[PDB]
Write an enzyme that holds these catalytic residues in place. Structure first.
Site, PDB file in Angstrom:
ATOM      1  CB  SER A 200      -5.632  -7.058   0.750  1.00  0.00           C
ATOM      2  OG  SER A 200      -5.366  -8.383   1.125  1.00  0.00           O
ATOM      3  CD  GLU A 333      -3.089 -12.991  -4.385  1.00  0.00           C
ATOM      4  OE1 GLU A 333      -2.842 -12.730  -3.185  1.00  0.00           O
ATOM      5  OE2 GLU A 333      -3.143 -12.123  -5.285  1.00  0.00           O
ATOM      6  CG  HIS A 446      -2.129 -11.425   0.070  1.00  0.00           C
ATOM      7  ND1 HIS A 446      -3.015 -11.296  -0.976  1.00  0.00           N
ATOM      8  CD2 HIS A 446      -2.600 -10.637   1.064  1.00  0.00           C
ATOM      9  CE1 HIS A 446      -3.983 -10.469  -0.629  1.00  0.00           C
ATOM     10  NE2 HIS A 446      -3.754 -10.057   0.605  1.00  0.00           N
TER      11      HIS A 446
HETATM   12  N1  LIG Z   1      -5.032  -9.158   4.307  1.00  0.00           N
HETATM   13  C1  LIG Z   1      -5.861 -10.126   4.766  1.00  0.00           C
HETATM   14  C2  LIG Z   1      -6.936 -10.606   3.921  1.00  0.00           C
HETATM   15  C3  LIG Z   1      -7.807 -11.645   4.444  1.00  0.00           C
HETATM   16  N2  LIG Z   1      -7.632 -12.149   5.669  1.00  0.00           N
HETATM   17  C4  LIG Z   1      -6.661 -11.748   6.495  1.00  0.00           C
HETATM   18  C5  LIG Z   1      -6.556 -12.344   7.778  1.00  0.00           C
HETATM   19  C6  LIG Z   1      -5.539 -11.935   8.672  1.00  0.00           C
HETATM   20  C7  LIG Z   1      -4.612 -10.931   8.304  1.00  0.00           C
HETATM   21  C8  LIG Z   1      -4.683 -10.315   7.032  1.00  0.00           C
HETATM   22  C9  LIG Z   1      -5.699 -10.693   6.087  1.00  0.00           C
HETATM   23  C10 LIG Z   1      -8.995 -12.220   3.600  1.00  0.00           C
HETATM   24  C11 LIG Z   1      -9.004 -11.846   2.080  1.00  0.00           C
HETATM   25  C12 LIG Z   1      -8.637 -10.353   1.878  1.00  0.00           C
HETATM   26  C13 LIG Z   1      -7.220 -10.066   2.459  1.00  0.00           C
END
Ligand SMILES: Nc1c2c(nc3ccccc13)CCCC2
Ligand SMILES: *[C@@H]1O[C@H](CO)[C@@H](O[C@H]2O[C@H](CO)[C@@H](O)[C@H](O)[C@H]2NC(C)=O)[C@H](O)[C@H]1NC(C)=O
Ligand SMILES: CC(=O)N[C@H]1[C@H]([C@H](O)[C@H](O)CO)O[C@@](O)(C(=O)O)C[C@@H]1O
Ligand SMILES: CC(=O)N[C@@H]1[C@@H](O)[C@H](O)[C@@H](CO)O[C@H]1O
Ligand SMILES: Nc1c2c(nc3ccccc13)CCCC2
Ligand SMILES: Nc1c2c(nc3ccccc13)CCCC2
Ligand SMILES: *[C@@H]1O[C@H](CO)[C@@H](O)[C@H](O)[C@H]1NC(C)=O
Ligand SMILES: *[C@@H]1O[C@H](CO)[C@@H](O)[C@H](O)[C@H]1NC(C)=O
Lengths: 531, 532, 531
Positions: A200, A333, A446
Site C-alpha cells: 500500500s 484491490e 487489499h
Molecule cells: N491503505 C489505504 C490506502 C489508501 N487509502 C486508504 C484510506 C483509508 C484507510 C486505508 C487506506 C489509498 C491508496 C494506498 C493505500
C-alpha cells in the site's frame, strides 16, 4: 540470559523468543531509536541522528505509533496484524523507532540477508509493531526489521517551498535504512544485502525510494505490494500551497507567508494538530462540493531533495542505478477493505451506469479521471454486459485498475526496460483471518497477501493445510528474492522473470505462471489519459 | 412590493413577499424569528427562556444559523433533503432558537388558517429548519407553515441523569416554539386553535415524544410522525445515562467527580471545544471496533421526569397520552441507502452471506439491540428464504428497517388506536427525481423520499415528471386535509381508511390505494423474539 | 429491602447496616445535598436551597470533601476517623452534603433526638465522612447527622465589606441546620430537639452559632469540644482587608477594589485557588519575619449577618441563645497533634526560658501575646522550676490555656451568668487509637475524646474493656444531654452543673466531679491581656 547487542550509539537489551519447530531462539529488539525525536523545532524538518546512551537500553516494549487518528489506526492494526491478539499502541510524535527480529546466533558471526518492512496506511495511519517478524525470521533465516516514520501532517505537511519541502516521512525511511547500514551487522545481518518491502502506502514508499538518489546504496532489492509511485492518490502534483493554507487555516494559523504558516504550526500541540487532522476528515471520500478539491490524504510531493521530478519523468530516465524489483497486486484491490475504510457510498449489489458515472466523478481524488472522460471509462468497463449486478463488480475492478493495476504494470515495464531484473505477481486468495464483516465472495482483497508474507498461519490459530502451505511458499519466494534477487528455488513453482513476454505469477490455492498482466487495461488507460 | 410588517407579542417583525407561479396572493415569508432567549453561557443545559422584547422593527429576512453540529454532516444532509432549487449554505451557532414562517394569508385582513409546525430530523445531532422551504405547501393548500429549530447533540441532550442536567433541552425547545405559536400565530393569519405538528425521523420521534408529554398539553391538535416514533429505540436512552455523560466530559477534558462538576465544567467550554468533543465522539457512525454494546451512536431523549415521566412503552401500556388525531407512516426501504451511507456501513460489495450478516447485525446493536444469542434466529428469519447473496443483502436491510421503523411505527399506531384516538397509517413507495445522483435506481422509498412530495419539491425545483407533480399535489392535499379536519380524506383523493381494528393503511406511490395489516407478521415475530 | 425516605426535595435511597448484638439495623444515608453546589458565580456567596430531583436519589456513596490541602486533609481524617479503615475521599467545590445515621424504625413514626456534628480542621481542612455515626446512633437511640461546609478560601474569604462579607462556611452550617428542621422528621428525628456539637473549629462553629441571630430556633442544646468563639486564632478581628489583598495578589489578581478582587477570584479554577492556598502555607507556623503579620488560617469575621459584633461584645450584652451548653477541654490540648501539624519548632525534651520566649513570640498568631508581655507570661509558667524538661511541658500548657482552657471557661462563665444551664468537663485519657508517632506520655491530647464520643471501641477492632467502658459512659452523657439538656442519668457518675461553685467533670479511666477548672489561669491571663 537476555541478548545484549552493541550498536553505534550504545548497548541494547532484547529478549529471546522461541517458535515451535525451531531450535534457535529468535532475538527480538523492540523500540530501537534510529533518529532524534522530531519534537519542537524539529517538527517539519529532516530527521537527525539519535543521541548516544550510556548503559544498556532496554529494548523490550513496543514503541508508540506516530500520531494519527487513534480509532482508524487501531482498526487498521486489527485487520492487518499477523499475531494472535492485536497489541494496543500509544500515540506520540516520538515515534521514530524500529523493531528487529534476528534468527542469527549472536554469539557467533553472521551476515544474513536483511528485510526492512515499510507498513502501509495511506501515509496517514499505521504502525510497525502491527507486524510480527517472528515467523518470517525463524522460517527463512533472515533478519526482519520493521520501521516507523512520520505520518499525516507531521510527515507530509508541505508549503511547496524551502520553508517546508515535505516528505519528512520518506526522509525518515531513508534515515532508518542508513541506520541499518551502520548497525545491522551487530544483529547478524548483512549490510551489503538489504531488501526493502512494503504494501500500500508502504509499497509506494518503496517505489519512491527506488527512484530516489537519497536512498542509493541503502538497499539491494525491492518489493512493492499493492502500491507504487504511480498510484496517484499518494502523490501530490502541481501547486501544494492551497492545501497547506487549508490546513493552516483549519489549525487557526495565519497564511501571510510560508515561513509564517510553518512557524505557527510548529507552535501547535500534538492534540491541536490531531484535532486539525480530524476536522480535515482525511481517509474519507468527500461527497460534497467539487471532487477535484478534496484531498483525502497528505502524501508525497516533488520536494527537490528526495524526488527531483515526477515519478513519471523519473521512470523514463534509462540509466539510474538499478536493483532487482518485485511488483505485485491483489485480485480485488478495491474489493472491501479500502471502500470500507473510506466510507465509500456503495451499498447496492446492483449498479447502473448513470450512478456509476456519478460515483466515479466523486472518486476523482482516487482516480483523477476528468469529468469529460467519465463516460468513456464507465462504458468501457460497464457497457460489457446487461447485468447490473456484474456491473458493480466491474466498477470495483475499474477503480482497482486505475489505483493499482495499471500503475504497477507501467512501473514494472519501465523497470524492465531500464535493464534491471523485474518480477510481477497477482495474489488471489481469501485468508481465514479476514474480517467477519467481509463477504465470503471477496477474494484477494487489499492486504490479503500480508498474512502469507508474515506467516500468520504460524502465530494465529486455525488454518487449513492449504493456507499454511501458501504462507510457506510465499515466505520462501520473498526470502529467496532477498537472498538472490530471484524468487525461484527448489520445491517452488516456477516464477518467470518479467521480460518482453511479460510473464508473471498468479499466487493462490493453485499457483502458476501466466503472461501479459493487465495488458488491455494499460493500453486503454494510457490512451484515455493521453487525451 | 412593500414588505409585510407583523406585530408580535415581543415586537414588530418585517418579512418579504414571494410569489409562486399559479397563485395570485403572494406568500409572506418571515425568516429567523427568535422564540426564546439565546442559550448562551449559563443558559447552556437549561430550559429555554422567553425572548427579550425589542423596539422598532426587526428585519426577519435572512436565514438564521443552524444549531452547532458537525458542519460537514449538517451541510450534506441539508443538500440531500432540501426541496428548494439551490441548497442554502448555513452558519453554525449556539444562538439558534429561531423559526421560519410561511403564511399564504392576506395579512391586511383577518385569517384563521390551519397551522403546520415542522420539526426536522437528523438523529437529534444535525439538521436545520431552513433546509425546508414552506412556500409550496403554504400556497397550494392554504396553511401556515412554520419550521422550527431546537438544540442538537451535546447542547440539546447532554444528561447526567439527575437534577444537575436532566436533559431533553432540545424537546423543551420544541415545546417553547409551540408555546410561541399559541401566543403569536394569530398575527400571521394562523389559528392557534388548530396546530398540527409533523416531522420526519428524529423529527417524527419528537412528535411522538410530544404526544406522550404533559408539557405539550394543549399545544397541538393533530400529529404526524414520518419514519420515526418514540419506540425507535436508538433515539430513546433507557437505563443509566451516567456512563455516556462521563465519557463526554472526559473527552472534553472534564473531571467526573460529581454530576454538578461535569455540568459546570462543560458550561465553561467554548462552542468550538464542544464541537471538537462532538467530532471526537464520532456520533452517527457505525463503530466497527470493540464491543458493540458500548457503542454510543448519538445523544438523545431520556426519561427526565419533566418532559417524560416514564418510558414510552409504559406511558402507552396505560392510555396516558394526548389522544389527538395521529398519522404514523413509513417508507418502503427506510434503511435502503441514505442511512447506511451516512453511518458508513461496510456494504461495498452489495452482497452478503448469512455469516457476514450475523456479524454486521451484531455490530448494529446500538441501532437494533438484538442480543448475540438471538442474532441467528433473527437472521435466519429474514435471509434463510433465499440463497442469492445480493437478495440476502436486501433482506438484511429490510430487517434493520423493520426493527428501527416498521414495527415500532405499527406498535405506536395500535396503541394510539386502542386508546380511542383517530389513527392513520401509510407506507410511501416512490423514488423522487430529486434523489442524489450517487443513489442507484433500484432504491425506492428510501429514508426521506416522501419529504419531496410533502414539501412540494416539484414546484420549486426543476425536472419533475407530470406523475411526480401529481403525487406531490395529492400528498400535500392529504396532509393539509388532515391538518384541517383530523382526517386526510377529501374529494378528488383516493380513499384513505382509518387505522382501526381492520388495520387499513394507505400505500402511497405511483399507484395509491388502501391496503390492510401493515407489517403484521413482522410485529408478531419481533414482539416474540424480544421477549426471549 | 433498602430504606427509601421521602424528603422535601425528593426521594433518597440509603442502606441498612447491622451492629453486632443489635436487633434493629441502622439506616444510613450518605451524601444528601442540603444546598445548591457553590460553583461559578455562587463562590463567595451565601448557600442557596438545593434543586429538587425527580426519582430516587441513590445516597450510598461518600460525598467529596470541600477543596483543601489533600495531604493535610487525608492525614487528619486518618488520625480522627472512628472506622476500622480510613476512607479515601475526593476533593470538590461541590461538597455541601450531609450524612445521616438513624436507628429509628422508618416504617413507623419516631421523634428521636437529633445530634448534628460539625467537624474540626481549623476551618481549612476536614470532612464529615471521617466520622461514622453508626455506634452513637445504635447505642443511644439518637439520629446522628454529620455535615460539611465550605473551607479555607472558599469558605472564609472576606474583603471586609459587602462585596464579600465572609463566613460562607458558617452560613453553610446554618443552611444544614435549616435542612434538618425541614426534613429530619422523615428520618425519625425530632426537629424540636436538635443538639449541635463539634470539636476544635467545629467547637468554635457551635460557639458562633450560639451567638448568631441567624441560628435562632435551629438547635436546642450545644456542645463545644476544645474550641469556642474566644479561641482568637479562628476569629479575625480588625481590618481583614490586608489578608484579602495578599490572597488576591498570590492568586495573580489586582487589588484595585473589593469588587475587582472578588470578581477576579471567582474566575480562578479550583486548582488555581488550591495552588494559592498552598503558597500561603496555612496550617503552618511561619518562622520568618514579623510574627504579627503571619496568618496561619482563614476564619470567622464580624460580617454583619452571622455576627453583628465580636464575641466579647455579644457575651457582655448577654445577647444570645440561652440553650443548655456543654463546654469542655482535653488535658493537653497542645500536647502533640497540633504542634505536629503546624510544623512547630520543638524537638528537644528540654527548653530554656530564653528559647521559650522566642518561640512564644513566634506563636503570636496562635496566642496574641505582645512581645513586651512575653517575659511575664513565660516567667509565670516556667520560672517555677529549673527542670528544663518540665519547662517545655509547661510551655505547651501555656499555649493550651491561652488557646483553649481560658477561652472555654470564660465562655462557660458568661453562659452561666446569662442564666442558661452550663456544663464543663476536662478529658484525660490516651486512646489506643493514637498515632504510632505520638509518645505514650501524651494524655488527653487534642481530639482524644472523639474516639469515646463516636464509639470507636465499637467499630475499631479489639479495644480494651477499659476503653469500651469509657466510650459507653461518654456516649451516655452526650446523649442524655441531647434529650434533657442535662447529662446525668442512672448508672453514671454525678456530673455537677456549672454554676457558681464551678463544678465540672474530670473524664478518664477514673471519672469524678471537681471544682474551679482553670480558675487561676483565667485570673492570670485576664489581668495580663488587660494591660
Ligand atoms: N491503505 C489505504 C490506502 C489508501 N487509502 C486508504 C484510506 C483509508 C484507510 C486505508 C487506506 C489509498 C491508496 C494506498 C493505500
Ligand atoms: C446505588 O449506588 C451504589 C454505589 O454506587 C451501588 O452499589 C454497588 O456498587 C458500589 C461500587 O461501585 C458498591 O459500593 C456497592 O457495594 C455495590 N453493590 C450494590 C449493587 O449495592 C448500587 O448498585 C446503587 N443502587 C441503585 C439503587 O442504583
Ligand atoms: C443570529 C441572528 O439573530 N440572526 C437573525 C438575523 C439578524 O437579526 C439580522 O441579520 C440583523 O442582524 O435576522 C433574522 O432575525 C431574520 O431576519 O429573520 C434571522 C436570524 O435569526
Ligand atoms: C511494565 C512491565 O511489564 N514491566 C515489568 C516489571 O514491572 C517487572 O518488575 C519485571 C520483572 O522482571 O517484568 C516487567
Ligand atoms: N443518521 C440518521 C439520520 C436520520 N435519522 C436517523 C434515525 C435513527 C438513527 C440514525 C439516523 C434522518 C436523516 C439524517 C440522518
Ligand atoms: N490551629 C488549629 C489547628 C486545629 N484545630 C484548631 C482548633 C481551634 C483553634 C485553632 C486550631 C487542628 C489541627 C491543625 C491546626
Ligand atoms: C526491561 O523492561 C521490561 C519491561 O518492559 C522488564 O520486564 C525487564 O525487567 C527490564 N529489563 C531490565 C533488566 O531492566
Ligand atoms: C432587511 O434586511 C435585508 C437583508 O439584509 C436588507 O436587504 C434590507 O435592506 C433590510 N431592510 C430594512 C427594513 O432595513
Amino acid at each position: 540470559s537476555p541478548p545484549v547487542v552493541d550498536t553505534v550509539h550504545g548497548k541494547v537489551l532484547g529478549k529471546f523468543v522461541s517458535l515451535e519447530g525451531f531450535a534457535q531462539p529468535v532475538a527480538i529488539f523492540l523500540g530501537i531509536p534510529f533518529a532524534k525525536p522530531p519534537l519542537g523545532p524539529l517538527r517539519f524538518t529532516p530527521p537527525q541522528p539519535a543521541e548516544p546512551w550510556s548503559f544498556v537500553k532496554n529494548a523490550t516494549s513496543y514503541p508508540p505509533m506516530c500520531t494519527q487518528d487513534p480509532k482508524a489506526g487501531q482498526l487498521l492494526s486489527e485487520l492487518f496484524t499477523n499475531r494472535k491478539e492485536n497489541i494496543p499502541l500509544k500515540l506520540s510524535e516520538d515515534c521514530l523507532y524500529l523493531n528487529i527480529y534476528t534468527p542469527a546466533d549472536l554469539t557467533k558471526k553472521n551476515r544474513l540477508p536483511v528485510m526492512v518492512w515499510i507498513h502501509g496506511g495511506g501515509l496517514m495511519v499505521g504502525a510497525a509493531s502491527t507486524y510480527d517478524g517472528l515467523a518470517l525470521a525463524a522460517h527463512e533465516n533472515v533478519v526482519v526489521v520493521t520501521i516507523q516514520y512520520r505520518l499525516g501532517i507531521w510527515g507530509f505537511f508541505s508549503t511547496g517551498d524551502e520553508h517546508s519541502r515535505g516528505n519528512w516521512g520518506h526522509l525518515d525511511q531513508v534515515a532508518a535504512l542508513r541506520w541499518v547500514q551502520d548497525n545491522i551487522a551487530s544483529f547478524g545481518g548483512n549490510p551489503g544485502s538489504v531488501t526493502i518491502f512494503g504494501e500500500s502506502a508502504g509499497g509506494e514508499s518503496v517505489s519512491v525510494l527506488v527512484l530516489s538518489p537519497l536512498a542509493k546504496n541503502l538497499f539491494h532489492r525491492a518489493i512493492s505490494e499493492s502500491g507504487v509511485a504511480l498510484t496517484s492518490v499518494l502523490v501530490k502534483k502541481g501547486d501544494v500551497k492551497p492545501l497547506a493554507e487549508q490546513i493552516a487555516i483549519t489549525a487557526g494559523c495565519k497564511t501571510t507567508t510560508s515561513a509564517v504558516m510553518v512557524h505557527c504550526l510548529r507552535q501547535k500541540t500534538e492534540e491541536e494538530l490531531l484535532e486539525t487532522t480530524l476536522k480535515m476528515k482525511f481517509l474519507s471520500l468527500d461527497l460534497q462540493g467539487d471532487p477535484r478539491e478534496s484531498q483525502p490524504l497528505l502524501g508525497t510531493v516533488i520536494d527537490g531533495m528526495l524526488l527531483l521530478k515526477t515519478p513519471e519523468e523519473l521512470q523514463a530516465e534509462r540509466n539510474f542505478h538499478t536493483v532487482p524489483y518485485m511488483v505485485g497486486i491483489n485480485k480485488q484491490e478495491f474489493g472491501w477493505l479500502i471502500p470500507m475504510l473510506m466510507s465509500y457510498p456503495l451499498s447496492e449489489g446492483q449498479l447502473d451506469q448513470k450512478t456509476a458515472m456519478s460515483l466515479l466523478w466523486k472518486s476523482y481524488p482516487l482516480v483523477c479521471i476528468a469529468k469529460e472522460l467519465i463516460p468513456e471509462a464507465t462504458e468501457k468497463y460497464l457497457g460489457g454486459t446487461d447485468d447490473t449486478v456484474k456491473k458493480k463488480d466491474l466498477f470495483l475492478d475499474l477503480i482497482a485498475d486505475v489505483m493499482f493495476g495499471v500503475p504497477s504494470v507501467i512501473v514494472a515495464r519501465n523497470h524492465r526496460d531500464a535493464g534491471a531484473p523485474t518480477y510481477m505477481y497477482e495474489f488471489q486468495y481469501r485468508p481465514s483471518f479476514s474480517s467477519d464483516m467481509k463477504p465470503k465472495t471477496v477474494i484477494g482483497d487489499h492486504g490479503d497477501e500480508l498474512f502469507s508474507v508474515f506467516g500468520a498461519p504460524f502465530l494465529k490459530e486455525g488454518a487449513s493445510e492449504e493456507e499454511i502451505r501458501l504462507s510457506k511458499m510465499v515466505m520462501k519466494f520473498w526470502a529467496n528474492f532477498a537472498r538472490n534477487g530471484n524468487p525461484n528455488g527448489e520445491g517452488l513453482p516456477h516464477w518467470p522473470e518479467y521480460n518482453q513476454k511479460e510473464g508473471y505469477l498468479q499466487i493462490g490455492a493453485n499457483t502458476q505462471a501466466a503472461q501479459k498482466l493487465k495488458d488491455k487495461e494499460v493500453a486503454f488507460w494510457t490512451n484515455l489519459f493521453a487525451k
